[PDB]
Design a protein around this ligand. Structure first.
Ligand code: KOI
Ligand code: KOI
Lengths: 304, 304
């Protein structure tokens, strides 16, 4: 009973957070095995951020310039390299708390948990989605740049995001753990605008199935639609087009509820056209799009 | 930048979760020092839940009937006692991962994080509030009954909730860690209804201050009000009456934004009377009441 925006338990990731300082810049790092990963802008002063030449700025840096502290104990840096927009600092000690892990590059629409940190210390955990414009709507302040996003499959942590930047509009940009930015963003103090933040249709449908499973059924209509008809309405409302791959992934939710995917599409089409009329679904007055179909199954089945 | 429903990092609590089984009933327990705390209904069969006499059912139970497993290793039970609606199982081993902790009984309107668990294993973490009717709107399934709610002050975990029950309406009830239910609920399979779930006014005001700090300012009006005038409108909209104690706690947010508390009350009064007109505040189409003034300060300042 009930449906919440739920994050993964963060303990396995808390055990990896470290503080990285270079000169007067401090941010967070992720310590896995004998490597600490952190945004490469740790080498920059605020002046350097205007137009940084990272390869050039890195020539002035040695292993001993990167101060890495895990808890209140200093780690010895024995190597450093730049991979895209991240630095990899080789330390002389493997993190004893390194969980089983993978580095994954997620697609827009995928959700993940963020462990927001400051000075290598966790402040909180929340659930995010990679937006269709490749920004995330997080909660980050100056100093949060070490922070990572991740998913867990039983005991394996798949790290998918490292936070680098806030856009002038207050939305967030970052990279995967190979240092490649999501979207077209660059790690420079230059104005960068985000594209259309469309609604993740397959996730809204998943959340309407979660609503039916939890008893919120008022929005179920007497209609059906087709993918093409639904998509004409999705386009008009800045929703992502729905494909047969999305219909396929919704199959288990359709099976569990007995509501055909296209019938749920027709109920969504009526909600878009009629609005909520002051009503709520799962305590929300808007259509929630940051639960994937897998998230709904996981939460509704009690996966640990 | 950004404002999210954020939970506390859960690692310190994950280190305390255990599985407790008695007969054919399995739920979660909280292992702190050499004591495991769990709902007393672990001793009941589904038939026993209709009208349980817990003292009588406990006479048929010995230490060896309580099976406690931490990870995949069994703990030896050397004592057991009932305190209100919880059992305290004394084990022969202190939990090596016991954090600094306190047991606190929270007031309605207070928020906390929940680490939802099944079979002593964490499934996820989310943020809750103790509702004014002493229910919580969680996300819990059968088997989640060990699960706890907590707050953290730097390194000390204050446990405030243990989950026991879902009401026929799908809202949740539980106890503090001394086993006293919040509200009038009893641990029995008998229909129990909840009272009015009013809106936590001081938390909505805190969230409107978070919205102004994060750039969402459209709702700021040219008016002010008084506590008595505001409360006439709060009563009409099923909002909790605002007191001078609530105004006092909002002082830091008023100081940080330069918006007098009563002016923010007048902006809230207009939102109640006019509605949102299809607009959003912090990505919500309703007024959010599960952030306390302390939560807003903590999140907006990056407390770790
Ligand atoms: O955005 C930055 C610093 C920065 C400036 C320019 C480029 C880069 Cl890569 C980083 N810090 C921050 C503040 C608030 C929330 N998230 C991040
Ligand atoms: O409510 C119960 C079992 C129960 C029945 C009657 C009394 C008591 Cl104390 C417990 N389990 C559950 C299921 C879904 C969500 N939260 C809890």
């Amino acid at each position: 009973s009930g449906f919440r925006k739920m994050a993964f338990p963060s303990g396995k990731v808390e055990g990896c957070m470290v503080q990285v300082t270079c000169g007067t810049t401090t941010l967070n790092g992720l310590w896995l095995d004998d490597v600490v990963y952190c945004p490469r802008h740790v080498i920059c002063t605020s002046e350097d951020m205007l137009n940084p030449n990272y390869e050039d700025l890195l020539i002035r840096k040695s292993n001993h310039n990167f101060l890495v502290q895990a808890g209140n104990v200093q780690l010895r840096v024995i190597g450093h390299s730049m991979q895209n927009c991240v630095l990899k600092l080789k330390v002389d000690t493997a993190n004893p708390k390194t969980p089983k892990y993978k580095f994954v590059r997620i697609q827009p629409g995928q959700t993940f948990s963020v462990l927001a940190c400051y000075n290598g210390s966790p402040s909180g955990v929340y659930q995010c989605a990679m937006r269709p414009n490749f920004t995330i709507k997080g909660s980050f302040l100056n100093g949060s740049c070490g922070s990572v996003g991740f998913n867990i499959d039983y005991d394996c942590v798949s790290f998918c995001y490292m936070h680098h930047m806030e856009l002038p509009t207050g939305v967030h940009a970052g990279t995967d753990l190979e240092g490649n930015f999501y979207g077209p963003f660059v790690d420079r103090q230059t104005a960068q605008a985000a594209g259309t933040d469309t609604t993740i249709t397959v996730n809204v449908l998943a959340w309407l199935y979660a609503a039916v499973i939890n008893g919120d059924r008022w929005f179920l209509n007497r209609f059906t639609t087709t993918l093409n008809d639904f998509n004409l309405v999705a386009m008009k409302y800045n929703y992502e087009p729905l494909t047969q791959d999305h219909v396929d992934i919704l199959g288990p939710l359709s099976a569990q509820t007995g509501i055909a995917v296209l019938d749920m599409c027709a109920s969504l089409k009526e909600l878009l056209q009629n609005g909520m009329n002051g009503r709520t679904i799962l305590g929300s007055a808007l259509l929630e799009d940051e639960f994937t179909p897998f998230d709904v199954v996981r939460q509704c089945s009690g996966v640990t």
